Design a binder for this molecule. Structure first.
Ligand SMILES: [Ca+2]
Ligand SMILES: [Ca+2]
Ligand SMILES: [Ca+2]
Lengths: 413, 413, 413
């Protein structure tokens, strides 16, 4: 074929009961620094855009060629001109060669790739704005190598960078080797990571940036992809168990955290399901929980659990009423790292959002949608003490109850 | 349908009689700081670009879906690589849901929207590179709510920002509520603005950035959209009368000036018309005049009037001779604000521009056009004293007569 | 017609035998600072992208209209998000009016243009990542003016900038007048350049940035474009002889070097050919050599010669084995300029690259291709002393033999 334009975009406004700014974000709680995302409904005031320009080509022999570039930007400003704070950057630029006539046996319908990209098989938990796994970087690999016609595999080499790319003394390359295997609804991903002499990176002064940072790592994922709502009702569901050690201890953005100690050990559980309660009510519950030890400091510990619940009630072919409920518990023990103070408590979010759209209201993924909303947030006051440049406890966002209102659009195509 | 690519672009060169750089710009006179634009022909040496990527969709039931992103940049450099000074930024990102089957009564053919955008109904005076009204920002609203089938209305909430978005103590959100009514050729726009605690923004030091800055404002527009040249000849014309007080005292870029005093008061008149003088001559006169008091400083006063006159003489199906005449009078009394000195006097611009094009030469808006030109400018020497980092009076641009030459292209689609 | 999307893109990874970063680039040898490029195969670890968005239009009378914007970026980082170091910028924005009914005689099928662009008639030596001639900037001109129906000419005015565009005292515009003539396989290009008071640019302090810099220049190109492999075998070839003086002494990027002395004198010879050795082997030899005197410092001298040899052996319809051999000799005498020390010696590069593609393997220009590789480099140890912030001799890249491995993709459409 030819050219294709795909993308994602969120844009909107959030204000408090006084008609002034406030804090918002899927990652605003103290637990968010370690990936403890909360519901995103009526809780994202940024204008984020991903523009995907493609050039596809199918040859007569069945062989396909595919080139794609992603140009992204995220702004918190509401103004029509944001040159001074622009974050516009090329996120991806890759080439895929699929269904080559020359590829036989287990490589029959396999697709080869090279360049900078997000792995094709990453998957997320939409309502919480968090990927379950996110393998991205620059490299090469092959998708869909079929063995015995019931076990497909992906093999790849992804490279990343730690530190300042400009400073040759504070810059290191991190390589990731991964095998991704699929057997029915079952998934098993195993990655090996290595960033040589990560521990010897010297900052601009001449001192070691870390010194106790890891140079290697291991990462694994065990996933269950069901075509039903946890096997007891119509719908879908995904449950994943993540584990990592050393550089692999940041279980979501594989190889994206250069500060991890050699003994960093993480376990994360991700799970969500989709199901219709009637021809008008749809429910999408979700859970994210993690336990991370000896992560950045010896003897530290980060533990948290999020529970998000998105509910949509159709009223028209175009009008719906969406509701969201977030609950999160955290017990954080940073051990001085980044001037963080040990904290524990819970966060609550209640959002009511009148929603307009044209597509299937029962489909949590039909996108052109415009929503109006109101949220209420509260949390254990102790949480304010985690950090001083935090959102929780900052000026005007320290009290018990916090109300917010706004409008926003979101789509993808 | 699918994808659409629209945009605008101007690019060219301007040199003086010595083959060296000079000053140029629709806003180069002292009057330009408060919106006093002048002719743009042979007076724009920047390479400005707006790239609009869209994804439209029309459903079988008549309902439309529309997503658009604007990415813009403006460079004064002539070089082929401008990474170091790039201003590439996302100006807009919005979604429009039109002609929904669920919308009845006055909402029949109305279109809902949300995101960052320039309001659909803003209009400009092209030859002077100035909008008449420019409502933009992030928010939501509805277009074309028909009452009694002869009175349409637009209602919206647009949000903007004052100060440095990164500095929480020097950052404020400004909200705007507007109702835009149309009755035949008549238009009446009324907006109310509010940026809470604008007056309490402290700069990076700890001092108040302004202190006497306004926190609220009101803005109004009375417009006449004629389908004839001022009702006495074939063509078109528009005449608008603008008024604003407080934050609304910047009558063009609504809610874009956070330094306005509470008692800031402005009146502005905009008017232009288009008409063919024969099957070869077309004329487009234009006028912009403003009177602003207690704007930035107590007792200040800004008053200016611009008169632009664009004439085109067809010679071929592809060749034309364009002429532009600009006259501007100003009486500015800044009262020490920004080290500006009271000044008064006039500015003159005469431009001759051999133009090449393929479209209708009589249409002032048929765009693909390439022009060669020569301009002469002169002004009251007193004007040079308004500012010291100004264009008028700077090195090599202080004398009476100033000649310029160049080539440029301009289009939109 | 309508919209068109074209572009170019390379993206890959290069690591040494320890799985860590190394130095790479077509211009990494000391000779590279003056244009001494070497083979690029398995020697480019950056993610460079050019995105060309166009809006074409053909009218019923045969007249065409064309608008193009180029947005480019280059990153050495492997990460998925590079906002902090993004180099995204508008490289071009121009308009072409072709085959106008009004244009008769020698201007019959000529095409008029204006804006910022890379000249249509520039050409390169792909395997070495170097243009032969590169005229770019902002201006206007006309292409294909036919005289006696066997002599076509291009005439144009391109403007560029020297110094910081923001600093009015350290900014100068350089203008270039050029006539490009074609008579069969023969080409003769002559350009005159001028940047008034380039020698009087004062840096931020108040001192002269150069003082002995040139204000004018002359450039000439003599080229032979053959439809055979140097007239003795099937294929193609191009041989060009470049000469420049003063500002014209940078013979590739015309008008791009503002530090050239008035007596700067350069001669460059560029030549390459393409030919199939059999139905499976293709060979592309190339040569670039230059002699530049009194360039930046009185009595300085830069002389180098690169010989590149690209060979491809088809094995399948999809698989090929590419080989590259680079040899370069240099004798550099900087005379204290930039703290460079006089150096002389040679550089060697051997690359083996298993390549996958769908297109014509024998065509060096069929692009969708993914390559895996291994390279070996070595050079005279003396070369390490040219500079201290150089690649040769830097930490971990000073020894004799240097091995590298990686994967990359490259395309254009
Ligand atoms: Ca806090
Ligand atoms: Ca002045
Ligand atoms: Ca060196």
């Amino acid at each position: 074929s030819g050219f294709e334009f795909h993308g994602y975009a969120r844009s909107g406004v959030i204000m408090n009961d006084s008609g002034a700014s406030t804090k918002s974000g899927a990652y605003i709680t103290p637990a968010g620094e370690t990936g403890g995302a909360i519901g995103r409904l009526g809780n994202q005031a940024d204008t984020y855009v991903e523009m995907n320009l493609e050039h596809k080509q199918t040859l007569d022999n069945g062989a396909t060629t595919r080139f794609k570039v992603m140009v992204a930007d995220g702004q918190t400003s509401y103004n029509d001109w944001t040159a001074s704070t622009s974050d516009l950057n090329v996120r991806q630029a890759f080439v895929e060669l699929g269904n080559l006539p020359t590829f036989a046996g287990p490589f029959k319908g396999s697709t080869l790739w090279a360049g900078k990209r997000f792995d094709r098989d990453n998957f997320d938990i939409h309502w919480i704005d968090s990927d379950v796994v996110f393998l991205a970087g620059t490299g090469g690999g092959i998708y869909d190598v079929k063995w015995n016609d019931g076990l497909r595999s992906n093999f790849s080499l992804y490279g990343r960078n730690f530190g300042d790319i400009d400073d040759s003394s504070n810059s290191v390359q991190n390589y990731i080797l991964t095998m991704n295997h699929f057997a029915g609804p079952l998934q098993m991903m195993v990655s090996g990571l290595r960033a040589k002499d990560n521990d010897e990176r010297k900052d601009s002064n001449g001192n070691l940036a870390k010194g106790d940072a890891a140079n290697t790592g291991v990462h694994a994922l065990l996933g269950l992809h069901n075509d039903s709502f946890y096997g007891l009702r119509d719908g879908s569901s995904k449950t994943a168990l993540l584990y990592g050690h050393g550089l692999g201890a940041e279980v979501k953005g594989i190889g994206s955290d250069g500060a991890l100690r050699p003994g960093a050990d993480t376990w994360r559980i991700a799970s969500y399901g989709t199901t219709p309660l009637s021809e008008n009510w749809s429910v999408a519950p979700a859970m994210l929980a993690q336990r991370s030890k000896d992560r950045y400091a010896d003897g530290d510990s980060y533990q948290w659990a999020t529970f998000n619940l998105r509910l949509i009630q159709a009223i028209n072919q175009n009008f719906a009423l969406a509701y969201e409920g977030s609950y999160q518990y955290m017990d954080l023990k940073p051990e001085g790292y980044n001037d963080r103070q040990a904290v524990n408590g819970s966060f609550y979010k209640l959002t009511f959002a009148p929603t307009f759209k044209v597509g299937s209201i029962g489909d949590f993924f039909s996108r052109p949608e415009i929503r109006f909303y109101t949220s209420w947030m509260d949390w254990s006051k102790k949480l304010n003490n985690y950090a001083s440049d935090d959102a929780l406890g900052s000026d005007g966002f320290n009290s018990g109850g916090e109300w917010s209102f706004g409008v926003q659009m979101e789509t993808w195509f």
